[PDB]
């Protein structure tokens, strides 16, 4: 056994969370009372990577739930599949975070940090041999934000040998709580660059764009993006909860994904994403999907960058030998787009159980320097505001310094820098 | 009679292992639960097979091979699956975590750990022995535990047992069915340390085991199965001298001997035909010139080259089924006059020739049709210098840019190793030039 | 869509190759080391080919054979049609060579200065050339002191073949000339002989009492463009196309081209390319060869054809170069990759 | 064409066809690769504890 621990942060970490294991509960036959009633046994052959086992063959997820308000989490207790959580495993204070970076990371998330680590390492203990961990935050608010990255930093200094990976929202103005969220998001870059070894960069905009103009969704709710994030999250684990040789645990996936140690956000792709929705999708038609912009949940274009690897994954009955012809004919019908100086970089994966309501699809997992696009986004909003000073009086009053945001400024300006000379 | 122990390292060494020891059973008569009729001496002897095969008071036949992987899911398989009994838990040793496609992984940090208890378990074996000859030992270059520890392995073997002899079963990395980028890094680095550590080594390209599985086997998508059931038949063929009655290569030492001039230039080419499929109506059976002929065919080398354009060393031939000298010479003298065999002036231009009457085993249900002959040709051309070439530029791309180092030092190797490592390859690439140009 | 690369950028047919598969706007070009191509136009000297055929899903194609060097080496092509059975050393349209090494340094020279003191003792003419593959230096001389100490001056393997001594001569002018013939071998080992061929003739009267000036004995375009003063004076740049050669040769000869000369010419090719067949043939390889050859033959006054030279990267002539290069991308590459006549080759048919 | 070394048994035979004529670190020292290892990844290690404790 190979245990990942999951922790979620925050209101968008959270929601997320709750819909990652709504759907991958469905998919390893688990009802929302962690009764197992599969029809394979294909369902439980992983099924320890995300589940405990207790008493009269219960399986509880190995999730940890974290937020400076209630609110969220109480709403997830009274979800669909809220009765699956260990009831231990709910961690919150009552103060919030305000949306502010500051107040999760050094003042109400720094009195609540140590609670949670003591429940991480509780579920650390009963693991065989524990993986590593993966957290879902959003980068704008305060919690996930600033308290998730105060949890990697933490996790870190007492798992120092294990594989930290995260399912980060990235903020977009087109859908914003708060005018703070570039500052926000630029703080936590700079901690995610540091000490985690993989990042889904799970961009809002993207989302929207893809809500609206390719799903249709005239105003698309945090429901609907959401959706895109629980299928997203199922296709890139998929490798980690189903047998198979091709990054089967998260340290072989950094081995094979991440040529140096700070390039490693990844754009996720997803295939179909229909609105008509009853028709079989071929596998030439999940190809060119999946490598499609349009299908990117970073929104960046890969014709922007090139891809320095790329992992794909495809779930259902399908040819074998048809996925490989396909595969086989983007690569060598776009090569200008993948590095030349990594051979054989694009990396293929089958799985036979499909996700609920398709016959097949496809996952893509991308490490392109057109993610540079996405920090430079960041970047110049956080610029826009930061040379007037405007609003910083909400981080100063929770002990920060200009000096910070000057540093993490420079720290993301570098990072962008790193990837445009690897696109050169 | 002198016994050989196997060693199966990583992944791609056990399950090769796997295929291996199942058709060495139904070679010798053995069955799953290790009882074998026709041995009349019970619980001992010193016949042939006997080099593979201890026995136990109750008339077991054991295999003499130690299983070694960093993850378990593999070796469980073994301790699970239909021959389980044949061995013991002592010869299967099985770690909680890989080396996740890392050398360094591999060969320093979690070798370090297990080293220890490998050569324990393989004493063991050893003590079972009255003249040991030395060890067969099956690993991928491309994973972090086949290309890591294996390097390792072969270091202290040379330390404990210097007088023994060491073979190698190498699978060479291919794209088709490979799940890491960074295996030419672990190729490399483990060439380099393994080198004067091994005294002959076959390497097989499962670009060559995939296409033969497509085109002569008809799968339009072959499994690690598929492959290992032909990789099986190929090793058979190459050990089955040391395991039945005869007088060519009948210990490891004659490897090195018929094969191997020149230490470092220890990398035999093999060729084998015919491959049949098994859901053919059925095949017109190969003659001895045909299959004969067939040994000089790109298509059905373990390594995919030209040797037309190399030169010749040393060259075996080891025939199963009908097959009688006459025949042998009367294909070779044919293939003199319509090949381009060009041996290095300093090497008698001769041909050993083995021939065993038991013709191939096929697997029941395999993908392989029984056919009345076959043969394997084992020739050291400078053509699989090749192989080399390929494996060496595509780490040149990649170190370039040091993609990928960081996780190599990171568990504690310098990255001169890097350099180290390659400047090597670089020695051997113009070694096979010196010899066949 | 197919893709290409280009590793020899000094070749001129293929830069016109390179340019017409652009146009067909189905073939892309990559970067020199972009391993996922298609087609190879490769370099010259130590083209990879251990690296080709190895890209999972990709036909690989390169504008080369490995091997055929054998043919293409000045000394080289002596050995191979000493040794092979196929051509023997009583080849009848190869004049008589020897390979020597220089001293400085198997080696032939006692066998050549044997067959030289039987012609001196003869009264035979007994006039000889020395040239090598490292040259732009010939020398042409009837004294074997002089052609042997020649050699032993440089560093490089020569070979001393005899000088035909009897060419013919083209009228008016009494000048001297060699015919070049293109060939082309696809992947499956067709020979295809390009229709057109090209005369590189001498615009010096041929003078047999002075092997000094080299002016009237070489043909080569160079040689006639710098040190000849009567260059372009019968044809445009000492270049006649079989259409005037042919005519010229009933005019004044009664025959054909075709019967002459060319019959012998197809003979020596398909000789030649037959006998490397097997050795360079990728028929069951995983990767496929083509190549264009240079064919250079000489004739002498009785209308019988000499091969003097075989070249493996060769230019063509100004005005064929537009037909040509068209015929290497119909026949050799979209033969192989398609696209979305009246054939400008002569197919010459053999046995594999 | 000549053949050698014939031998025959039940099983099988084998001979030679000649068809032309001519013309380590101990285990000490592996300790010590072991260990440097080792320590470099000890002194990684402490050097990210010390960035984590700043
Ligand atoms: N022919 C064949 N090749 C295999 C097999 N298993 C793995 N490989 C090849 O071996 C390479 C990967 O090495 P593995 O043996 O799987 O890795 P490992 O030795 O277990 O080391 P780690 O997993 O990193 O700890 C890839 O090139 C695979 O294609 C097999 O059963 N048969
Ligand atoms: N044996 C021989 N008898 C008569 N003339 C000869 C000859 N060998 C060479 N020549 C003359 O030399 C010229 C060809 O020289 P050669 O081909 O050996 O040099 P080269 O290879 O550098 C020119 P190319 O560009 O055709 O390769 C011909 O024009 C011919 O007239
Ligand atoms: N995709 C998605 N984004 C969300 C959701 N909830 C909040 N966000 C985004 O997350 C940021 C606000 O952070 P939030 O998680 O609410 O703050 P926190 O509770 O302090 O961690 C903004 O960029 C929002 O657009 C959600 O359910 N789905
Ligand atoms: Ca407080
Ligand atoms: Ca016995
Ligand atoms: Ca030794
Ligand atoms: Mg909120
Ligand atoms: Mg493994
Ligand atoms: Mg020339």
């Known amino acids: ?424 | 009679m002198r016994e050989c122990i196997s060693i199966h390292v990583g992944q791609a060494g056990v399950q090769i292992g796997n295929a291996c020891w199942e058709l060495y059973c139904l070679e010798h008569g053995i069955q799953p639960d290790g009882q074998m009729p026709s041995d009349k001496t019970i619980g001992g002897g010193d016949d042939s097979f006997n080099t593979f095969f201890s026995e136990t008071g109750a008339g077991k036949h054991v295999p003499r091979a130690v299983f070694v992987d960093l993850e378990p899911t593999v070796i469980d398989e073994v301790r699970t699956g239909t021959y389980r009994q044949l061995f013991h838990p002592e010869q299967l040793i099985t770690g909680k975590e890989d080396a996740a496609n890392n050398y360094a992984r591999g060969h320093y940090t979690i070798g370090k750990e297990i080293i220890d208890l490998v050569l324990d378990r393989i004493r063991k074996l050893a003590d079972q022995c009255t003249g040991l000859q030395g060890f067969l030992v099956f690993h991928s270059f491309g994973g972090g535990t086949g290309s890591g520890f294996t390097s390792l392995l072969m270091e202290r073997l040379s330390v404990d047992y210097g007088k023994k002899s060491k073979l190698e079963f190498s699978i060479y990395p291919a794209p088709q069915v490979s799940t890491a980028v960074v295996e030419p890094y672990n190729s490399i680095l483990t060439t380099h340390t393994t080198l004067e550590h091994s005294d002959c080594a076959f390497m097989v390209d499962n670009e060559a085991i995939y296409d033969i599985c497509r085109r002569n086997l008809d799968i339009e998508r072959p499994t690690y199965t598929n492959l290992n059931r032909l990789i099986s038949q190929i090793v058979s063929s190459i050990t089955a001298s040391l395991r039945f009655d005869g007088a060519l290569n009948v210990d490891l030492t004659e490897f090195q001997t018929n094969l191997v001039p020149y230490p470092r230039i220890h990398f035999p080419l093999a060729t084998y035909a015919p491959v049949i499929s098994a859901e053919k109506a059925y095949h017109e059976q190969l003659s001895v010139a045909e299959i004969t002929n067939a040994c000089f065919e790109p298509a059905n080398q373990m390594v995919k080259c030209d040797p037309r354009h190399g030169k010749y060393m040393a060259c075996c031939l080891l025939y199963r089924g009908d097959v009688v000298p006459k025949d042998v010479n009367a294909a070779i003298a044919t293939i003199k006059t319509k090949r381009s065999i060009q041996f290095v002036d300093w090497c008698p231009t001769g041909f050993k020739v083995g021939i065993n009457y038991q013709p191939p085993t096929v697997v029941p249900g395999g993908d392989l049709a029984k056919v009345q002959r076959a043969v394997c040709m084992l020739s050291n051309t400078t053509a699989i210098a090749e192989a080399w070439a390929r494996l060496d530029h595509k780490f040149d791309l990649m170190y370039a840019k040091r993609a990928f180092v960081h996780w190599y030092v990171g568990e504690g190797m310098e990255e001169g190793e890097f350099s180290e490592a390659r400047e090597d390859m670089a020695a051997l690439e113009k070694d096979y030039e010196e010899v066949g140009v | 869509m197919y893709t290409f690369v280009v590793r020899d950028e000094n070749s001129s047919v293929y830069a016109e190759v390179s340019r017409l598969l652009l146009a067909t706007g189905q073939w892309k070009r990559l970067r020199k080391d972009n391993p996922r191509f298609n087609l190879m136009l490769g370099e010259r000297n130590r083209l990879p080919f251990g690296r080709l055929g190895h890209e999972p899903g990709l036909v690989q194609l390169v504008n080369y054979y490995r091997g055929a060097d054998k043919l293409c080496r000045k000394a080289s092509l002596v050995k191979l049609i000493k040794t092979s059975p196929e051509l023997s050393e009583s080849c009848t349209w190869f004049p008589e060579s020897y390979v020597i090494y220089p001293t400085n340094l198997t080696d032939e020279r006692e066998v050549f200065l044997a067959a030289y003191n039987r012609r001196r003792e003869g009264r035979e003419g007994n006039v000889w050339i020395a040239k090598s593959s490292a040259g732009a230096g010939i020398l042409i001389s009837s004294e074997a002191s002089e052609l042997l100490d020649f050699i032993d001056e440089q560093g490089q393997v020569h070979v001393i073949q005899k000088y035909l001594e009897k060419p013919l001569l083209l009228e008016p002018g009494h000048r001297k000339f060699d015919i070049r013939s293109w060939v082309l071998v696809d992947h499956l080992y067709n020979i295809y002989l390009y229709r057109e061929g090209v005369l590189r003739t001498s615009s010096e009267p041929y003078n047999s009492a002075n092997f000094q000036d080299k002016t009237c004995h070489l043909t080569n375009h160079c040689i006639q463009k710098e040190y000849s003063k009567n260059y372009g004076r019968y044809e445009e740049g000492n270049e006649m196309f079989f259409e005037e050669f042919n005519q010229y040769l009933m005019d004044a000869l009664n025959t054909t081209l075709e019967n002459s000369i060319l019959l012998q010419i197809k003979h020596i090719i398909r000789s030649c390319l037959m006998c490397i067949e097997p050795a360079i043939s990728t028929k069951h390889l995983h990767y496929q060869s083509f190549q264009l050859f240079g064919f250079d033959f000489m004739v002498d006054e009785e209308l019988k054809v000499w091969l003097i030279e075989v070249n493996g990267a060769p230019a063509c002539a100004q005005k064929l170069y537009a037909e040509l290069c068209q015929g290497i991308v119909d026949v050799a590459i979209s033969s192989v990759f398609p696209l979305a006549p009246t054939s400008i080759f002569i197919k010459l048919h053999h046995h594999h | 064409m000549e053949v050698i070394e014939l031998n025959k048994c039940t099983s099988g035979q084998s001979f030679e066809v000649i068809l032309k004529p001519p013309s380590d670190p101990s285990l000490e020292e592996i300790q010590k690769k072991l260990e440097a290892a080792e320590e470099r990844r000890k002194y990684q290690e402490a050097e990210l504890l010390k960035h984590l404790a700043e």
């Open chain 1, 1 to 424: 056994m190979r245990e990942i621990v999951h922790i979620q942060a925050g209101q968008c970490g959270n929601q997320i969370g709750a819909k990652f294991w709504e759907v991958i509960s469905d998919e390893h036959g688990i009802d929302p009372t962690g009764s197992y009633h599969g029809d394979s046994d294909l369902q439980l052959e992983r099924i320890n990577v995300y589940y405990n086992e207790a008493t009269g063959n219960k399986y509880v997820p190995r999730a940890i739930l974290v937020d400076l308000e209630p609110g969220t989490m109480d709403s997830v207790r009274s979800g669909p599949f809220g009765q699956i959580f260990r009831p231990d495993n709910f961690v919150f204070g009552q103060s919030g975070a305000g949306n502010n970076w500051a107040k999760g990371h050094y003042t109400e998330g720094a009195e609540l940090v140590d609670s949670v680590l003591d429940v991480v390492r509780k579920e650390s203990e009963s693991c065989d041999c524990l993986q590593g961990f993966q957290l879902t935050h959003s980068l704008g608010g305060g919690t996930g934000s600033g308290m998730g990255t105060l949890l990697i930093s933490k996790i870190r200094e007492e798992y120092p040998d294990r594989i930290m990976n995260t399912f980060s929202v990235m903020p977009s103005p087109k859908v914003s709580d708060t005018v703070v969220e570039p500052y926000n998001a630029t703080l936590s870059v700079h901690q995610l660059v540091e000490n985690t070894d993989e990042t889904y960069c799970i961009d809002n905009e993207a989302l929207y764009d893809i809500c609206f103009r390719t799903l249709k969704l005239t105003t698309p709710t945090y429901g609907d993006l959401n959706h895109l994030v629980s299928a997203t999250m199922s296709g890139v684990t998929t490798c980690l909860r189903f047998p198979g040789q091709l990054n089967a645990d998260l340290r072989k996936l950094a081995v094979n994904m991440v040529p140096f140690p700070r390039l490693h956000f990844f754009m996720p792709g997803f295939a179909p994403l229909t609105s008509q929705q009853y028709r079989a999708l071929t596998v030439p038609e999940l190809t060119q999907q999946m490598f499609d912009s349009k299908n990117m949940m970073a929104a960046c274009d890969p014709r922007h960058g090139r891809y320095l690897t790329v992992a794909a994954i495809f779930r259902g009955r399908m040819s074998m030998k048809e996925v490989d012809e396909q595969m086989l004919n983007v690569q060598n019908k776009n090569s200008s787009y993948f590095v030349e100086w990594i051979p054989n970089n694009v990396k293929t994966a089958v799985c036979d159980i499909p996700p609920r309501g398709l016959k097949m699809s496809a996952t893509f997992i991308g490490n392109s320097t057109a993610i540079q696009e996405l920090f430079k986004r960041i970047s110049e909003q956080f610029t826009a505001m930061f040379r007037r000073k405007a609003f910083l009086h909400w981080y100063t009053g929770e002990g920060m310094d200009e000096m910070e945001f000057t540093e993490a400024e420079s720290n993301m300006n570098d990072l962008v820098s790193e990837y445009q000379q690897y696109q050169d």
